[PDB]
């Protein structure tokens, strides 16, 4: 009974840090996707040159 409430308060005491880390993980995935998009296009540009 009390163990459930302690767990729930430990989550709340890090709620802000939780959201910043989740957002960071999303931003890191988007960057990684954009980096692959650049590699893909640079390969085309290189091939279209000669």
């Amino acid at each position: 009974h009390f163990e459930d409430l302690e767990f729930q308060q430990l989550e709340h005491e890090s709620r802000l840090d939780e959201e910043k880390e989740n957002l960071t993980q999303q931003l890191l995935r988007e960057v990684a996707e954009y980096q692959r998009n650049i590699v893909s296009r640079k390969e085309k540009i290189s091939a279209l040159k000669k």
Partner: protein, 225 residues
Amino acid sequence: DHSDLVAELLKELSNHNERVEERKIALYELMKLTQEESFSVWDEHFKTILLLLLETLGDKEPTIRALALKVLREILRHQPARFKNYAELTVMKTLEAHKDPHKEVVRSAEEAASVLATSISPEQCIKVLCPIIQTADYPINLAAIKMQTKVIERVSKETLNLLLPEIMPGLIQGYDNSESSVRKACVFCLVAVHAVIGDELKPHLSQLTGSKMKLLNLYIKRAQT
């Protein structure tokens, strides 16, 4: 001696949704002869008795459902070797009872589940719980996670490592579940996993955020002390 009683127990228990008092007594007599280990005809009648008992879990009367779970619990305790071929069926029936509207049925199912987790083959039980943990609805998924924890407490390092690719995805996903009870159950399960393989759990948790890792490590350092 007992074979005459069994005949009564069978024909009475097959009376679904009728004669409540007569079936309670038959269930109590069966349960009493199981605890006393006086039932010398398990080798002859176990299969039929079990199947009639599992069908009784779906009775209209909640008092019947709760009692049948209590009987199942004692049969699991004294005759666990006979559930080898009915392991999957028994697990799913016991877990399903956890979503019963009546609290006495749920409580009996929880008691039966705790015994079941230690009366069943460790490897077999994990492989049937993994798809349940990931797909089933609350609180059946919650019950499955708790049952998995009890099983992991009874396995070796090598046995667990060969089952980790099936276990981990459900626990990671469960840590992000809506229900706080499910999230808490997943943390405790991970603690049980860490108790076995140690710091070999770290690379499997590369997806978890910093604060989620700190909460897990909080319960890990709490367990070992």
